[PDB]
Every structure is written in structure tokens, then in C-alpha cells.
Symmetry: C3
Subunit: 333 residues, 3 copies
């Protein structure tokens, strides 16, 4: 009887940050209540001022990461304000039935709905918008996120022993297909509907114009770099709703990687690079052993450094000359 | 001595269906005899009437699924009728030696050959045509299929316990590269030879014009949807002879997945999406828990919903409100 | 104290060959000293005479394979002769800290540097050039290789038992983006700097013009085929620094495959094809059971047979009619 389970409301936070949660469940199964508000908005995605009509869950690209435990119930209130112009819905890869929920959550502008599903499988999963006839357009306009379903006793290593993270970050990787004029300049549009016909032609080339973390070129660099300290254990959740990616931490590794994101499987160890298929979320665990700046990239290095799929870690602490040292600094022969 | 083994002739069925077989072998190793007839034919691949010169095993795209048990012998009689115009052969990824058999099975129109090989490794494997100098052209014209080599004691889960399927379906995913005129219209040709020079240029862009299940856009929708019932255990074999794919069951999961298709390895559990590399066949096992329509897609959603890589399951049974329910139906705020 | 460890200098050999080494370590941890010299050079990559400005470690594409054991120290002396025109560095995916070493190894023409790092994780790993602002350009100009860090007790199978190879080969797969004129002809340039602006536009299409093994179309065919004998156990190390690949041995298998190249994980068994993500090195182990010619390809067959990603094995020995035989040779019906 769901009527007799405890309920908790959770307010979501903007990526790359993640709302507070317990790794090991302290209570029994609960109904976890979330609310998301759909927002269609103009987004500037590169340093040149390229502007797109993004379609977002809660105003961010990606949508926020939701965290629950196995066999909790997720209750999502989904609001489509009448200032929006399009029909939207939501499809949880974590859920069983009704096209992930998409058949039960179609909301026109000015409508809302509340969906509930049981989180029967532990792992990280994608959620995305999926309205009939327009699925790729909404997803590649930024309307995707992820949900993490933790095992009730937390994460384990390949030998069944507990793994505990100190920090968790969520990196949503987005491929964008911005229509171009005949000379190669990106087009601007007044409304989302105006862009549709050009957007379809652009999608059909299968060649993204931009591939970004957290909605924009450089969004996770500079003052917005991810931070950690030597000795800290960091979980990085990475999702790609449409296109394969291959994350790599430059100067580090994935000590424990669930590349396809499902926690009943044992992790891969010591990865340099791992493949997250389009339509999947993965998770990688690393313990920092050296301070300094790290780059986190899609290791198709064109996609990373030309199209935008690169971010930074800033890590503090003491340098370890046992692991690495410059014996002879660069000098003339 | 092969002369003293039992022999059985098997007649193949058209995909997505699979010829009758036993999951657990009831006899010892046998010589399993198959016959396939090559057919070059015109095929209409989309709703707009786009027509291509397909090259097929047994008149279908994909070719039929063959099922044998580990350490059986496969004896294939391959017929190239004199109404065809091209040299063909066959390369089994399941076989050891002579380029998978391709060196021993070259048949001009009006020729036939009989090849035998021992199926020493359990798994699902691709077979495809591979004539020297023209391999990609024949494969991307539809001349590929798959063969399943079952362990003699059947499928097992990650703990070594028996897994038994109630239904099996074979989904062959095909990338097509239809030449286009300067305005973007697809070209028609009178014979396969006429298309060759344009087809090579089209293949070299590495961008498919169509990606389809079972030979055509919508081939597995409508009246041709795959069917199942709540509680039934379904094995879906998926092959892609040329290009990576990432299957996903919308509203479901891969409970047990051999993404690279080889049964001596333990399955991945609880997959939302899995990557089948080009040149590989994979298999996914799912038990349906909710009725209704499911979509089965390549989760590059452009490839699925714009280029054709989507099919349907129709599943009967009782809806389970514990797993999913609409608490508040879509309504005005 | 590094001052008290033994030291050995190792001279590198040109791929596909690999410098001599022990599979099982006979000594304790050592400082292994390597020297590499950067060479910018013109390279002819296809039969049509297409010429590119390659950027190489030690004059080859790929750079040479380095072999050490877990917890050895690698000491690399890196020389950038004043006949070169560009800044270069090196990033080891095997190393921890300072962007894989790239932050500590920037050398202008006429400069050298010596870097040391501890090889704490067993596996095959990519190394590549990575100068700030120009990373994809240097990598896709051929400036990448691999390093193998063997477990001190050698390779093991999925049950922990020793696997020993008789021969080892290194296949470096390179995607090239040669700029083209309006008619589709490849452009020539006098210096690397002259090509930069065109090369960036070419890279941004994400469509390689050539994909080759060992620096050129056909580099591993003919007299340069890899060789083996029936009964020999062969380790093939395969790297791709920028783009996914899916190797396949035509007529054979990967008996034991570490697709993401990391030896603390158990191998995948009986693979027909496996995916090596861009930015990764993998390793496959096979025992030849049939003589003859084998093709080793990227099983995107367009990339293999149209763009260049195919090589040959020549294998000697006795044919085994139990595994495969032509029952009826190709003949008229
Ligand atoms: Cu939407
Ligand atoms: Cu989806
Ligand atoms: Cu053929
Ligand atoms: Cu093949
Ligand atoms: Cu360089
Ligand atoms: Cu790298």
C-alpha cells in the first residue's frame, strides 16, 4: 500500500551539482517527490554568440540529476507553463511500461501531470523528452537529464566491498545541430517552430555543429571548473541521450567505471577511456593523487577541442614526485 | 568421422522469425544442412518509394537466422542462379579459416557450392557476402545475416543458472547509402552494375541515407509489430554487419545482454542501452512486465526516428499499477 | 629511493614490431630509459601519391610501442630537433598527473626534456602529443603511439591461469583529414603551418579521408604482411588515439580480448569483433588453427576497404579439414 509509505519532497539543484542524498539508505522504501518545470528559452552556446532555442527541464541543459534508492517510488510533478509553445512529455529509462512514462505525461502549454513509478533496477539512467513525431528535435535541443538509482547498501567494488564517494558531479553532454547558411554561418530564429524544418535537415547530416558539457562551450572551465582535493574520492556521472561519447580524464583514470551505468554489474578497473553509448548514462569513480588542473574530455579530440566537449578539474594538494617528476626541464640541447 | 554423424536438413524462415530449434541439445553433434539461394532484386525501402538494388540471401534483408549447437557441423549449399548478374560468396564470422569461408564459396551466376565448417564457439555471429574488391558494396546492399551457435546445455545467467526463452526474434539492422542528385533526391538505376560508381561515392561520405530494421522503414510496425505477452521471456538477436548500433527497448530493459554476442561470457545486467559494434551480432533477454506498445530503436534518435531504425512490440496482459501509474492525468493548472 | 634502483636503456623498434622484453618480470622494479626524437616529415599515404605533413615520434606512424612492467619507472628523454618547426609535447595515458606529462614536456625546436613517471596500472595505454590549442591537429597528423604495462607475473586468462604469447605485433590505426579542393582532389602544402587553417575545416566535418594501419594504405599487406604459423599464440595490440574502431580478424577470432586494454579486468572470450573507443588501446590474443591469408580490418567495411583500414596475416602450416572444408567446389548447376 503506497498510502502507508513515508514521503519526502526533494528540491533539485542545477548541474553539475547534485541534490543532497544518502549513499547508504537509512530508511526503508519511500515515495520521493520531485517537481520539474519545463522552460523553452534562448541559450547562447559558444564564444561567438551562437544562439539556440533550448528546451529544458528546470531551465538547465542537462536537466537536474535525481537520486533515489532501489525500490523507492519516484513521483514526478511535471509542469508545462503556458508561456511555452510546444507539447512535451518525459521518458525515464529507469521506468517500466508506457514508453518510459512518455505515453502518460503529454502536457500542452498550461498543463501539468504527476507520474509515479517504482525504481526496480539500480544504476544511472537517462530521462528525456519524447513527443511523438518530434523526439530527436526535443532531445537535441537539450531536453534530457539523468536519474541515479543507488543500491540500498551503496556502491561496491569488483570484490563486493563498499565504495564511498566524497563528491559527486553530473556532466550532461549535448550534441547540437545548429542550421547553417550557405557560407557556414549559424542561423538565428525568433521562435522554436520557425527552426523546425531547418533543424531536421541539420540533424539528418548526423554531424553535430557543437558538442558541449553543461549547455555551452567552456561551461565547466575557468571559475566553473569542477573542484577536488588530493585524496578525495569523486563520482562523475556522465550522460549522452543521443550520441556515443568516450570520456577521459587527462592526467587521471577511471579507477572504477560502470560504462553502461548499471550497478548490479562489476565495474571495469583502471580505464583510460570508456565508451558511453548514445542513450545511456555511465559513472566513473576516481581518487585524485596529484594536484593541479585536469581536463575532462570526450576523447574524440576533434569533438573535445574543436566542437566544445571539454571541461576542467582544479585539484589542490601536495605534488607527489614518486608518481611523476620532470628530471630535466625543457632546455636547449 | 563425419560420415558416421547424424544429419538433419533445416528449412529457413524469413526474419524476424526464426526456424524451429531446441535450446538444450537433445542429441549429440550433428551435421546440420542448410540451403540458401542468392537473389538480386529491387527493394522499396521507404514510404516515398525509394528503390534500391538489394543483394540478398534467400530473398530477405537480413538473411535468415541459422541456429545450431556448439560443435555441430554446418553444411551450407549456396546457389547463385543464372538470373543474377554478380559474383557472390559467404563469410561466416562463426567459422575458422579461409576468410570465414569466403575464399572457398565464390560463385558466378549459374554456379553453386557446398561448404562445411565446425561451429567451435558458442554465440551469435554475423555472416555476410565478401567478394574481393566489392565487399562494402555487397554488405550495404543487404547481403548479410546471422547464425546462432547455442551452448549444448542452453543459455545461462551470470550465476550459471538456466535461462529459457519463450520467443525469439531476429532484427537485422541495415545501413543504406542511396546515391543522391544535386538537389537531394535519390537516384534510380536499371541494374546493379549501373549504380556501382555512384554507390562508392555515397559510401565514402560515411553517412547513411537510411538505417532500417528488416529491410525497410516501418517494416516492424503496424501489422508487422513483434508480439509478446506479459510474463513471456523474449530473446532478441540484433546484428549490424557494417556500423555500430545501440539498441534500446523503450519502456523496458535488457535484463540480460550479451552486447558482443558471445555466450561463454557472463551477460551484462539491467541495461538501458547497449552498443553492438559494426561487424557483430548481440542478444538481449527480457521478461515483459507491462502490456502495451513498446518501441525498439537504435538510440541515436536521429537514426531511429529520422532515418528508419525503429520497430514496435505489441504486448498483451494486465497493467501493473505498482510499477507505474498516472497519479494526476494531464490537465490544466 | 630512485637513486638505488637498477636502470636499463631500451632501444625502440619500428612498428608493427615490438622491442624485446620479458613477459614475466625476472627482476624487481627498474627505471626503464627510453629516448624518442620528434620528426616532422612528408608522408605519402595512398597509392595515388597523396602526401601529408606527418608529425611523428621516432619517424613512424604510429610511434613505437614501449613495454614495461607494473611499478617500473619510465624515464623518457624527448628531443625536438631544430629542423622541426612546431612545439610538441607528450601525454601518457599511463601516467598520473600534469595532464599525463603534457604540462612538463613542452619543447620548442632545438629543445629536449626528460620526464619520469611510475607505471602504477597494468594495461595498454595511448600516448600522444597534446600542445595547448592544437591537440587534434597533432594527433591526427600521426603523433601518437602506445605503451604496454605488463603485470609483473604476465598475462592471465579469465580463470587466472597464465597466457603466454609467441609473437606480439602493434597496429596503430590513424584517421587522417586531408583537405580537399572543390572538385574533391587532395591539396598539397609546402610546410605544416601552411596546412593549419584548411586542416581545421577538414577535421570539423568529422569525416576522415583516410583511415590506415601503420601510416599508409596497404602498409601491412604484400611483403609487409604480418606472419605467424598454425599453433602460434599471437598478441595484437591495437590503438586509436582519436576515433572508435572495431577490429576483426577475417577467418579468425579474438580468443581473449581486453577491448579497453586494462589487464586487471578479465578478458572477453571468443569475440568476432570488439570496439576500441577513440583514445584507447586494446589487446587481443589468438591461436592460429588454419594456414593461409587472413585479413585484419576495422569492421566498418567502408573504412576498411574504401578508406584504408585493412592489413594481412600470412600463416603457414597444415590445413585442418575438420574445422572447414569445401564439400562441393564452385561449379555449374
Ligand atoms: Cu519536449
Ligand atoms: Cu530513450
Ligand atoms: Cu554478394
Ligand atoms: Cu566480416
Ligand atoms: Cu606534436
Ligand atoms: Cu589523451
Amino acid at each position: 500500500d503506497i498510502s502507508t509509505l513515508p514521503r519526502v519532497k526533494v528540491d533539485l539543484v542545477k548541474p553539475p551539482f547534485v541534490h543532497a542524498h544518502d549513499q547508504v539508505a537509512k530508511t526503508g522504501p519511500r515515495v520521493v517527490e520531485f517537481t520539474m518545470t519545463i522552460e523553452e528559452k534562448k541559450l547562447v552556446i559558444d564564444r561567438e554568440g551562437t544562439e539556440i532555442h533550448a528546451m529544458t527541464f528546470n531551465g538547465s541543459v542537462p536537466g537536474p540529476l535525481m537520486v533515489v534508492h532501489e525500490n523507492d517510488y519516484v513521483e514526478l510533478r511535471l509542469i508545462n507553463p503556458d508561456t511555452n509553445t510546444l507539447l512535451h512529455n518525459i521518458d525515464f529509462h529507469a521506468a517500466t511500461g508506457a514508453l518510459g512514462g512518455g505515453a502518460l505525461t503529454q502536457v500542452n502549454p498550461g498543463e501539468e501531470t504527476t507520474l509515479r513509478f517504482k525504481a526496480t533496477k539500480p544504476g544511472v539512467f537517462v530521462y528525456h523528452c519524447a513527443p511523438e513525431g518530434m523526439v530527436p528535435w526535443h532531445v537535441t535541443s537539450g531536453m534530457n537529464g539523468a536519474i541515479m538509482v543507488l543500491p540500498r547498501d551503496g556502491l561496491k567494488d569488483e570484490k563486493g566491498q563498499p565504495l564511498t564517494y566524497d563528491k559527486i558531479y553530473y556532466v550532461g553532454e549535448q550534441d547540437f545541430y545548429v542550421p547553417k547558411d550557405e557560407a557556414g554561418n549559424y542561423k538565428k530564429y525568433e521562435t522554436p517552430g520557425e527552426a523546425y524544418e531547418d533543424a531536421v535537415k541539420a540533424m539528418r547530416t548526423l554531424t553535430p555543429t557543437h558538442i558541449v558539457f553543461n549547455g555551452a562551450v567552456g561551461a565547466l572551465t575557468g571559475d566553473h571548473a569542477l573542484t577536488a582535493a588530493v585524496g578525495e574520492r569523486v563520482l562523475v556521472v556522465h550522460s549522452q541521450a543521443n550520441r556515443d561519447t568516450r570520456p577521459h580524464l587527462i592526467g587521471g583514470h577511471g579507477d572504477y567505471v560502470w560504462a553502461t551505468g548499471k550497478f548490479r554489474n562489476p565495474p571495469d578497473l583502471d580505464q583510460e577511456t570508456w565508451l558511453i553509448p548514445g542513450g545511456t548514462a555511465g559513472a566513473a569513480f576516481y581518487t585524485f593523487r596529484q594536484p593541479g588542473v585536469y581536463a575532462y574530455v570526450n576523447h574524440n579530440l576533434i569533438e573535445a577541442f574543436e566542437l566544445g566537449a571539454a571541461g576542467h578539474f582544479k585539484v589542490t594538494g601536495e605534488w607527489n614526485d614518486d608518481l611523476m617528476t620532470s628530471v630535466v626541464k625543457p632546455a636547449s640541447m
